Amino acid sequence: PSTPEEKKKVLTRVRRIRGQIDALERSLEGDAECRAILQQIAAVRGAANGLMAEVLESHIRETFDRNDCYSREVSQSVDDTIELVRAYLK
Amino acid sequence: KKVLTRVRRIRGQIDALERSLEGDAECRAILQQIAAVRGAANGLMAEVLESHIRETFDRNDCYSREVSQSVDDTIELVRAYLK
Amino acid sequence: PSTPEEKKKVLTRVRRIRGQIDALERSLEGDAECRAILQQIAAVRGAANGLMAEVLESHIRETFDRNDCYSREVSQSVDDTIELVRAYLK
Amino acid sequence: KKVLTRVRRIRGQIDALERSLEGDAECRAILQQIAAVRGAANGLMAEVLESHIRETFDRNDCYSREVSQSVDDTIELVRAYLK
């Protein structure tokens, strides 16, 4: 993030991830079944990966823009690149 | 246990990332740290799995040098895949 | 596998994986799109994982049996364990 | 184009696995080798993505040291996640 607007959304998501980690401690200290925990942990990893893709997409786009290089073909390269990352970096 | 040890390290990573963001760090650094959170979610999953597996086979009243390896190799395999 | 029957099923699956690696090789010899290649590689990995579970499950089962220790609860534990491995080792 | 480099070495692992089985190796050893097949496929994926990412951002006629690093950093993540 470079824009203060991007700073805000990421902080939101990051906080929401601390929100998911709270419920995991809450569940760990309590009466949780390993299958419910593993699921909570998996959703943490899902959330991180979600955000990683959103930061990456945003970073790549800003790089091309500072370089006066943003066009529709560049923009779609990024679309293509992020679909792959979303699908294969887990 | 060794599990909460890891839940804190995760919380540790998220608060630093929350602060990286507050302290306006460079984008490479934000990505570096989100990837590291994911890596620790995998490491934590490798503990909780290791717990449930260790615990499920002591529970079955089958002790043996041979059964212990079988359970070490299962754990070694989990560790390879999740690190 | 210790059993001469289980050696055969596994050896099929391994060959079926060679068959997938040859199709992948065809697709790099000739030219298919870069997303169809990724999909092929993921399918190889899905096949390896798939077999890693089948072998793991059989190995654990044999260990309890060989120790005169096989019951239904031991059997369902292995069911519970493999379902997790299938779901979380990728 | 060092994709064949790896597709070969992966075929190398499958045949050794086929030998292990024909040659009555330990059940522990089969699992070790199947995990390494999976590990190789991930490495293969980390090359094929690297090919595509590089190829896709040179094709945009946008050169600059700052753009090169953004692409290095992308490729670093790809490597971190897959090995």
UniProtKB/Swiss-Prot annotation, chains A, C:
Cellular component terms per the entry's GO annotation: cytoplasm
Keyword field contains DNA-binding: yes
GO molecular function: DNA binding; metal ion binding
Site entry: Important for response to formaldehyde: P1, C34
Signal peptide boundaries: none
UniProt entry keywords in alphabetical sequence: Cytoplasm, DNA-binding, Repressor, Transcription, Transcription regulation
Pfam families, A to Z: Trns_repr_metal
GO biological process, one term: negative regulation of DNA-templated transcription
Subcellular location: Cytoplasm
Keyword Transferase applies: no
Top-level taxonomic group: Bacteria
InterPro entries in alphabetical order: Metal_Tscrpt_repr, Metal_Tscrpt_repr_sf
Similarity comment text for this entry: Belongs to the FrmR/RcnR family.
Complex and partners: Homotetramer.
Function statement: Formaldehyde sensor. In the absence of formaldehyde, mediates repression of the frmRAB operon. Acts by binding directly to the frmRAB promoter region. In the presence of formaldehyde, it dissociates from the frmRAB promoter region and allows expression of the formaldehyde detoxification system encoded by frmA and frmB.
Protein name: Transcriptional repressor FrmR
Lineage of producing organism: Bacteria, Pseudomonadati, Pseudomonadota, Gammaproteobacteria, Enterobacterales
Gene label: frmR
